[PDB]
Design a protein around this ligand. Structure first.
Ligand SMILES: Nc1ncnc2c1ncn2[C@@H]1O[C@H](COP(=O)(O)OP(=O)(O)O)[C@@H](O)[C@H]1O
Lengths: 126, 69, 239, 11, 232, 139, 248, 378
């Protein structure tokens, strides 16, 4: 339950907005004519419980949740890193709707080496 | 028997149900750019008689470059 | 975005000195925040004094230092480096007065302090000082003045500034404040600094949880409001 | 660094 | 050139001292300044836009004097500007005490540039990442020089460093007639900045100095406001 | 063995576009955000013939852009889109879609079913203050 | 790879940095000095000739070292200033110490040692500047000296450095003239060589720069011909060019 | 110097007094004075003297004559900058006087010389006058290249705000005559408007009127209300802005009679601006079709008299418009005059089978021929 995460009333309230709304009452977004908002970037000190809030949101909506440890997706061999991201979104098309929770995203988003542009390619794929 | 080949979507050949749904009037402005693209990737398929009437083989590639967004 | 970084003297390809950049991110490692608000004739600096022990000699846990009889400074960032920056400043002013016949205007004291920090950014000898300084002083012909010198040596004249972990909201709060122009009375300024620090953190600000400095045009001397006064001020803020 | 890799085929 | 980018004392295989170039990137990504030499004098402009209202716009001035007849405008790392100016005023001064005449703007840049080149000959000192525009009126002919972090000093008639510099130059070559006068020149200089300054040209947002026959002087907020009002 | 396999891709790209096996009626559209890093062989009139450029919308394309994103949005009659299309800031196309998609999201939060002029200004200051971080010392 | 420091010897014995440096001269402007009795000339190219660029010096590539010594430059701008600064200071010291003009060659050796000395002690970047010297002395009269970034110098009768050095040097050979090198012939060839060496045709007068050194009544006037005379010079070559087409 | 200033003033007051003979005489009298003054000062002086002279409404026929005499006069003294100046104004005068072929020819001469010469500031001005003259001549595909010539040369010059307005207004007319894209037609008008607005020029109103027209023609007669009040439109708010306002409601309410009331209520506001007439007339001539079809949709035979009552148009007006609509294959029907009825009906297909047979017959007709040739071999 949202209640189980503690002291994030405002933050939990916000993340409800962007994530929950387009999935449950799309009419509101299509009534005003704006495409449903998609995506929430939760930044904070490690262990604060970013994942849980992102996990409760799945539990309330009863929508499938896919968790990707973003740092892991950046494997050494070339083009594997873009591919894991590609399979994630391609997996989503098959199973809808799924909160794609990417863990620390600093790795893939945020220069002159073969490997220094593989990070560049993976961002472009994302 | 010679069964019909199968190359419908091997590399994501846009199916009749994957049309992006963005009409030309929906794109805003880009008056000059749209015509240049509309002159190498759209027009030749339809009006190929016009291209061959002037003796120029229709341009085959377009490279849209510019600031992101 | 790590860049060549590992050396302060080697430019990143985009023209960004990453090592200098990391300096500021070291600035908030102190875990505290200081706010300076310039009023009609006063400047008030409020800091966070979070003494995490019953054994700490509370008298010496201060972030506020007195650079000179008319200029007071607060450090936000690494205590060790902030101490050196304080000590280097004091000489810089004393050399200023001894060299030109008058007290160094608060304007330059950040300039010379900034200039010292800037050469540590070129000549890869000294690791940069990881602390921002705020100089407050009643300057003749220019009223109370406030300045904030950063690790890279950038100083500016601030109607109000705050450096620390919650800088973005502290400045946004102040930015909201200064705009609805009002008669910034000494009581108003001291109140404004306390509210700014309070709102960002969401704390009650017990009497001893902060160290508010005050400098006024009427009595151009650096003073640190004694714990009795902050309570009086704090109760005034409530009502 | 970035390493391209070949591959065999266990029949 | 991939591994030779870092050290400023190691030629790349193509004979390219990359580090100087990357420093020039820091200039090409700085506050826009514009310079125009009108047959009556030299006009310089730069945008002094702060990040919030909390700043005191009059605190730090970019368009600055060196002597009574020379001034500077910079587009790059600020603090690296100040170290440049001081060695500029001292150098402008060290010329006066020795020769007793105001330093010709050609010499000052020849020695304000030679100051720059000093830091680009050894490892352990970063290049001065601030291109400089120097205006002066000496020997009855307006002067506008640009000294770079690379140590090369030009003789620009009218240019603009900083963000969106390519566009600024294109506006010049368009609205720059070698036969203007200082009065018209100020309007052109402001307009060149207007092509990039993202906002209203408030009198505490653009700082302009005029290098005329009498000497250089950082325009007071009002007079610019008189100028800015006219242009708008 | 890595920059070599990125180069084996560009060359395989070059060889099919204009190579010994000429194809009939296969047009190639390519989009890039840099336009100079591209290999000179892939910009030579024959493979990528028309190098269309998409420059940041001027004070005019911004108007047309605003009129198409909003012409579906419910705008309260007091929203003069010409008040925001004149501001000199060099907003890009996503930013105009942004300044509009989030503009309505501000209205949606307050449960109001009509985007008001107040939000657009609240929206208009969020999609353009992109410095934020900076560091003040690069200027 | 052994190109990290200017003092590291490659296994074959090549100071790579010096090869990298002197090879760097290629990116620079073209300067040439032709064979000439009773004179010798330098012709440079103003690579950057944009419009908004106010011309204040008129001699961006030709410097006067001593009262009878002129040297061009082809390389780094910053290093060019410091070498031209060190060159003059060396020449004037010789005049002060011996009350006699520095006899050309000892000027090049003085600078060449300074340039070479950088190629020996570590931590100093090899001067990436070659520079033509012309002048006169009481010892051998008009001389031409070609300095290199690697310090090695050498007397020359006609040479070009920088952009398209190969094209200029060969042609200066192809029509190379020995003995019969009067100044007028030198001028015609000098602009003649720049015509093809300089990619942009028409050798527009302002886009070229000729400085000549002559011994007049024992005064050694070092001249930097103004645009007007270049226009007629370009015209003089221009008129001669048309007459050659008659072959067809 | 002192002699230069006064003669500027005398013409202005004289222009106010309209002593064209005195002004024209002054212009010819100031001719020796023009020699006594600088080429730059005289140019703008003669310009202002000529502009002021041509400004006066005393159209006595010497305007073309004087400009020709001014054109020759510059020819003798060799004041090429001025002669390109009088010519530039002369092309402008011709266009306003309806004398087009002459306007194009002289301008075509001006473009011949200007192209190689300097003063690209005049190339855009003259290149525009050809662009707008080519529109009146009805040569639209040649105006599109003409204007893009001014906008392929405007990008390389200063383009003052006044000129930047003209290169727009003429660039919204040419997107309007093509009747293909309006949103682009409207965009240029709005940009054209703001340019004139700033300079406080009288033609900024023509900018606004066309903007409303672009909105009206785009099937959006509701947006007209907004702009007609707007923020920069209130200052201009008058009859002209009201003229388009009444038409807009006419299309929104779709009342051919109402539209006709507007076209008659306001004659010098819609019928005197040919861009507003040609385009608006096409509207009413189209609003009638879309309304005729809606009325006839139910009926299968309706007295031509009755359709007149619904559309609120005279039987003759609907008698014709029906005739052209049937003729042009708009709707499938027929007008019988002896019963005063329009016989609506459905067109049956072209029964492809018979078309494949007729084509096949010719096919086999050709084969039977080739059989002949085999028969000749015997
Ligand atoms: N603020 C919190 N509220 C509730 N549970 C929390 C909180 N912080 C951590 N937890 C606990 O830790 C886990 C969630 O931490 P996690 O979301 O992975 O942290 P982060 O993503 O910030 O690194 C759960 O077991 C949860 O019960």
């Amino acid at each position: 339950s949202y209640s189980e995460i503690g002291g994030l009333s405002e933050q939990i309230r916000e993340l409800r907005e962007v994530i929950e709304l387009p999935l449950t009452n799309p009419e509101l977004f299509q009534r005003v004519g704006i495409i449903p908002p998609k995506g929430c970037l939760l930044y904070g000190p490690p262990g604060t419980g970013k994942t849980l809030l992102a996990r409760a949101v799945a539990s309330q909506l009863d929508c499938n949740f896919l968790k990707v440890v973003s740092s892991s997706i950046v494997d050494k061999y070339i083009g594997e890193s873009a591919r894991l991201i590609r399979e994630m979104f391609n997996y989503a098309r098959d199973h809808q709707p799924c909160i794609i929770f990417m863990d620390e995203i600093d790795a893939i988003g945020g220069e002159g080496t073969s490997a220094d542009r593989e990070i560049q390619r993976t961002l472009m794929e994302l | 028997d010679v069964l019909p080949p199968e190359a419908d979507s091997s590399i994501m050949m846009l199916t009749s149900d994957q049309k992006p749904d963005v009409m030309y009037a929906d794109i805003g402005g880009m008056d000059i750019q749209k015509q240049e693209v509309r002159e190498a990737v759209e027009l030749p398929l339809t009006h190929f008689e016009l291209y061959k009437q002037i003796g120029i083989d229709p341009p085959r590639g377009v490279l849209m470059y510019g600031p992101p967004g | 975005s790590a860049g060549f970084d590992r050396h302060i003297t080697i430019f990143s390809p985009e023209g960004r000195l990453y090592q200098v950049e990391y300096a500021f991110k070291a600035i908030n490692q102190g875990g505290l925040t200081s706010v300076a608000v310039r009023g009609k004739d006063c400047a008030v600096i409020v800091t966070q004094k979070k003494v995490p022990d019953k054994l700490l000699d509370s008298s010496t846990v201060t972030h506020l230092f007195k650079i000179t009889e008319n200029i007071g400074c607060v450090m936000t960032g690494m205590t060790a480096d902030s101490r050196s920056q304080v000590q280097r400043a004091r000489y810089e002013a004393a050399n200023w007065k001894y060299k030109y016949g008058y007290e160094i205007p608060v304007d330059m004291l950040c300039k010379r302090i900034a200039d010292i920090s800037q050469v540590y950014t070129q000549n890869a000898e000294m690791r940069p000082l990881g602390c921002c300084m705020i100089l407050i002083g009643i300057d003749e012909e220019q009223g109370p003045q406030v300045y904030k010198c950063d690790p890279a040596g950038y100083y500016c004249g601030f109607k109000a500034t705050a450096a620390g972990v919650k800088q973005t909201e502290s400045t946004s709060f102040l930015e909201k404040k200064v705009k609805k122009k009002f008669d910034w009375t000494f009581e108003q300024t001291v109140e404004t600094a306390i509210t700014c620090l309070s709102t960002v953190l969401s704390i009650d600000f017990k009497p001893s949880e902060i160290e508010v400095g005050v400098v006024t045009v009427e009595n151009p001397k650096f003073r640190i409001l004694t714990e009795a006064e902050i309570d009086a001020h704090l109760v005034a803020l409530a009502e | 660094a970035x390493x391209x890799x070949x591959x065999x085929x266990x029949x | 050139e991939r591994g030779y980018s870092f050290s400023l004392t190691t030629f790349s295989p193509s004979g390219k001292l990359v580090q100087i170039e990357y420093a020039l990137a820091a200039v090409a990504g700085g506050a826009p300044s514009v310079g125009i030499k009108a047959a009556n004098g030299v006009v310089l402009a730069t945008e002094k836009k702060q990040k919030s209202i909390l700043y005191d716009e009059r605190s730090v001035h970019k368009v600055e004097p060196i002597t009574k007849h020379i001034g500077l405008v910079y587009s790059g790392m600020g603090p690296d500007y100040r170290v440049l100016v001081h060695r500029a005023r001292k150098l402008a001064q060290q010329y006066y005490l020795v020769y007793q005449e105001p330093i010709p703007t050609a010499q000052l840049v020849q020695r304000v540039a030679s100051v720059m080149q000093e830091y680009t000959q050894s490892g352990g000192v970063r290049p001065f990442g601030v291109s400089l525009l120097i205006c002066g009126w000496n020997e009855g002919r307006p002067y506008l020089f640009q000294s770079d972090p690379s140590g090369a000093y030009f003789a620009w008639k009218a240019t603009a460093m900083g963000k969106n510099y390519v566009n600024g130059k294109t506006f010049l070559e368009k609205r720059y007639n070698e036969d203007l006068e200082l009065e018209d020149a100020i309007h052109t200089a402001i307009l060149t900045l207007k092509e990039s300054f993202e906002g209203q040209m408030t009198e505490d947002n653009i700082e302009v100095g005029i290098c005329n026959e009498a000497g250089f002087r950082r325009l007071t907020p009002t007079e610019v406001k008189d100028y800015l009002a006219a242009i708008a | 063995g890595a920059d070599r396999e990125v180069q084996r891709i560009l060359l395989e790209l070059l060889n099919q576009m204009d190579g010994f096996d000429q194809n009939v009626n296969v047009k190639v559209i390519m989009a890039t955000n840099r336009a100079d890093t591209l290999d000179p062989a892939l910009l030579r009139p024959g493979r990528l013939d028309r190098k269309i450029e998409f420059p940041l919308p001027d004070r005019r394309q911004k108007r047309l852009i605003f009129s198409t994103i909003t012409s579906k949005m419910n705008l309260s009659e007091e929203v003069d889109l010409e008040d925001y299309v004149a501001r000199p800031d060099k907003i890009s196309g996503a930013d105009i879609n942004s300044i509009c998609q989030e503009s309505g999201m501000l209205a949606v939060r307050e449960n109001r079913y009509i985007v008001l002029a107040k939000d657009f200004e609240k929206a208009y200051k969020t999609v353009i203050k992109k410095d934020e971080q900076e560091h003040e010392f690069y200027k | 790879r052994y190109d990290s420091r200017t003092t590291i010897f490659s296994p074959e014995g090549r100071l790579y940095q010096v090869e990298y440096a002197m090879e760097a001269i290629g990116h620079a402007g073209t300067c040439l000095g032709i064979l000439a009795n009773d004179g010798v000339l330098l012709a440079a190219e103003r690579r950057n000739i944009h419009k908004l660029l106010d011309e204040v010096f008129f001699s961006e590539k030709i410097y006067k070292l001593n009262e009878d010594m002129a040297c061009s430059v082809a390389g780094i701008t910053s290093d060019a200033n410091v070498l031209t600064n060190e060159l003059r200071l060396i020449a004037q010291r010789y005049l002060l110490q011996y009350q006699e003009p520095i006899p050309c060659e000892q000027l090049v050796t003085a600078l060449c040692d300074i340039k070479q000395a950088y190629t020996q002690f570590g931590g100093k970047r090899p001067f990436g500047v070659s520079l033509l010297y012309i002048g006169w002395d009481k010892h051998y009269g008009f001389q031409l000296y070609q300095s290199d970034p690697s310090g090695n110098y050498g007397g020359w009768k006609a040479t070009c450095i920088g952009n398209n050095s190969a094209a200029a040097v060969s042609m200066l050979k192809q029509d190379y003239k020995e003995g019969e090198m009067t100044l007028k012939s030198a001028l015609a060839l000098a602009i003649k060589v720049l015509n093809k060496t300089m990619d942009v045709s028409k050798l527009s007068a302002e886009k070229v720069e000729i400085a000549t050194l002559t011994r007049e009544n024992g005064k050694t006037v070092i001249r930097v011909l103004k645009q007007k005379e270049v226009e007629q010079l370009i015209k003089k070559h221009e008129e001669e060019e048309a007459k050659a087409e008659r072959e067809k | 110097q002192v002699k230069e200033q006064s003669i500027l003033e005398l013409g202005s007051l004289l222009a106010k007094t309209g002593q064209a003979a005195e002004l024209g005489g002054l212009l010819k009298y100031v001719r020796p004075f023009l020699n006594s003054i600088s080429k730059a000062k005289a140019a703008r002086l003669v310009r202002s003297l000529l502009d002021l002279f041509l400004d006066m409404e005393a159209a006595t026929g010497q305007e073309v004559e004087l400009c020709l005499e001014c054109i020759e006069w510059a020819k003798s003294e060799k004041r090429t900058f001025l002669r390109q100046a009088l010519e530039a104004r002369l092309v402008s005068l011709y266009f306003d006087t309806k004398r087009y072929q002459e306007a194009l020819h002289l301008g075509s001469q001006l473009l011949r010389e200007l192209k190689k010469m300097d003063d690209k500031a005049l190339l855009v001005e003259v290149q525009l006058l050809e662009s707008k003259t080519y529109h009146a001549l009805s040569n639209l595909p040649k105006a599109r290249a003409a204007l893009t010539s001014a906008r392929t040369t405007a990008n390389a010059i200063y383009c003052p705000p006044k000129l930047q307005a003209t290169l727009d207004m003429q660039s919204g007319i040419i997107h309007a005559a093509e009747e293909k894209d309006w949103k682009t037609a409207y965009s240029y008008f709005y940009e054209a408007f703001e340019g004139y607005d700033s300079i406080d020029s009288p033609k900024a109103i023509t900018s606004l009127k066309y903007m409303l027209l672009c909105k009206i023609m785009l099937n959006t007669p509701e947006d007209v209300q907004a702009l007609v009040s707007g923020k920069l439109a209130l200052r201009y708010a008058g009859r002209q802005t009201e003229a388009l306002k009444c038409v807009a409601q006419a299309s929104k309410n779709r009342s051919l009679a109402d539209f006709e009331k507007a076209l008659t209520d306001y004659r010098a506001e819609l019928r005197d601006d040919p861009i507003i007439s040609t385009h608006l007339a096409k509207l009413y001539d189209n609003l009638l079709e879309q309304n005729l079809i809606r009325v006839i949709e139910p009926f299968s035979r309706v007295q031509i008299e009755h359709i007149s009552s619904l559309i609120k148009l005279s039987k003759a007006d609907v008698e014709r418009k029906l005739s052209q609509m049937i003729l042009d294959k708009k709707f499938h029907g027929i007008l019988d005059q002896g019963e005063g009825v329009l016989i609506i009906f459905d067109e049956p297909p072209v029964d492809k089978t018979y078309e494949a047979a007729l084509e096949t017959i010719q096919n086999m007709s050709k084969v039977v021929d080739s059989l002949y040739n085999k028969a000749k071999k015997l």
